[PDB]
Amino acid sequence: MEIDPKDLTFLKELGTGQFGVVKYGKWRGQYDVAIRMIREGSMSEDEFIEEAKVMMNLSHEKLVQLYGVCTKQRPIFIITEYMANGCLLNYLREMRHRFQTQQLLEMCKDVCEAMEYLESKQFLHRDLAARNCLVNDQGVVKVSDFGMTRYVLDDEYTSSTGSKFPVKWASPEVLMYSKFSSKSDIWAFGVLMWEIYSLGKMPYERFTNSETAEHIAQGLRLPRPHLASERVYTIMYSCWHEKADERPSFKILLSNILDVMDEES
Numbered sequence: 262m263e264i265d266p267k268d269l270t271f272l273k274e275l276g277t278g279q280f281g282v283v284k285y286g287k288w289r290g291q292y293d294v295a296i297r298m299i300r301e302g303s304m305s306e307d308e309f310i311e312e313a314k315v316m317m318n319l320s321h322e323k324l325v326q327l328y329g330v331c332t333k334q335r336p337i338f339i340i341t342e343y344m345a346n347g348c349l350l351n352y353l354r355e356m357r358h359r360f361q362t363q364q365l366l367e368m369c370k371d372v373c374e375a376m377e378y379l380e381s382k383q384f385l386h387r388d389l390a391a392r393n394c395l396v397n398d399q400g401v402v403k404v405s406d407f408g409m410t411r412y413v414l415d416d417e418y419t420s421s422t423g424s425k426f427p428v429k430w431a432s433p434e435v436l437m438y439s440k441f442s443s444k445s446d447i448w449a450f451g452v453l454m455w456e457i458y459s460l461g462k463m464p465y466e467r468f469t470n471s472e473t474a475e476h477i478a479q480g481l482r483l484p485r486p487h488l489a490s491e492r493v494y495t496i497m498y499s500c501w502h503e504k505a506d507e508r509p510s511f512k513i514l515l516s517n518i519l520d521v522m523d524e525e526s
């Protein structure tokens with residue numbers, strides 16, 4: 262819903278992100294919130310606003326809840342749930358030896374649940390990666406920056422050959438056909454699981470983007486992480502089938518995850 266800045270407070274700077282500056286603050290006094298001030302010239306604003314209204318109506322425990330926006334001024338403000346531990350990539354790296362495989366599988370269950378809810382709303386992420394996931398005060402992982410890439414103006418960020426495109430999270434049909442689907446979000450989720458169990462290593466760290474794309478096209482798949490059991494690897498590997506229809510939905514994935522977690526008890 263629209264928010265009157267009268268009801269917001271700026272209390273601390275959290276840093277500038279990929280899609281504009283972000284600050285920590287309080288909404289209506291009692292609500293811990295993270296206020297993003299969108300950059301200017303980066304997004305198709307009207308379209309972006311309408312999609313913001315759609316992502317505002319999305320609610321789920323494992324989705325960074327969106328509380329509102331301030332759009333009748335510029336820069337647009339986006340008021341979101343405050344995730345105290347920041348991006349999942351750095352949470353993974355700072356607490357590298359501070360994790361047990363039970364916690365890793367939990368973070369994957371968290372993400373998979375959020376993506377199964379996004380799947381059921383016919384809403385695509387288009388850029389699922391650890392750098393777009395956040396961690397709260399209790400250690401739970403939640404997805405964020407979902408659907409943001411549909412409205413980015415920089416063609417480097419959007420085109421298949423753009424210098425900033427996340428090829429290393431992209432399915433073959435996204436690199437070759439630009440055919441984003443829930444199956445491409447599933448491929449990306451597979452890569453994300455690999456990030457988690459790798460404790461935040463860059464997939465295909467030393468391959469150039471082109472080299473990665475071609476290797477993927479010819480059958481290359483990420484190596485089983487050291488911290489991944491053969492069952493976890495089987496699960497993240499099923500996301501990376503060459504044929505899109507052969508990949509399991511997020512629901513079937515969540516079921517497999519809970520079966521393995523139960524057997525990991």
Ligand SMILES: Nc1ncnc2c1c(-c1ccc(Oc3ccccc3)cc1)nn2[C@@H]1CCCN(C(=O)C2CC2)C1
Pocket residue numbers: 275276277278283295296297316325327339341342343344345346347348351395404405406407409
């Ligand atoms: N909420 C938050 N809490 C805490 N830090 C947050 C954030 C957001 C954020 C704000 C608004 C959002 O708007 C959305 C939400 C969902 C979908 C689309 C847009 C989505 C995310 N960004 N940052 C930080 C910003 C700079 C770098 N960061 C670090 O941690 C540094 C230590 C590495 C993360």
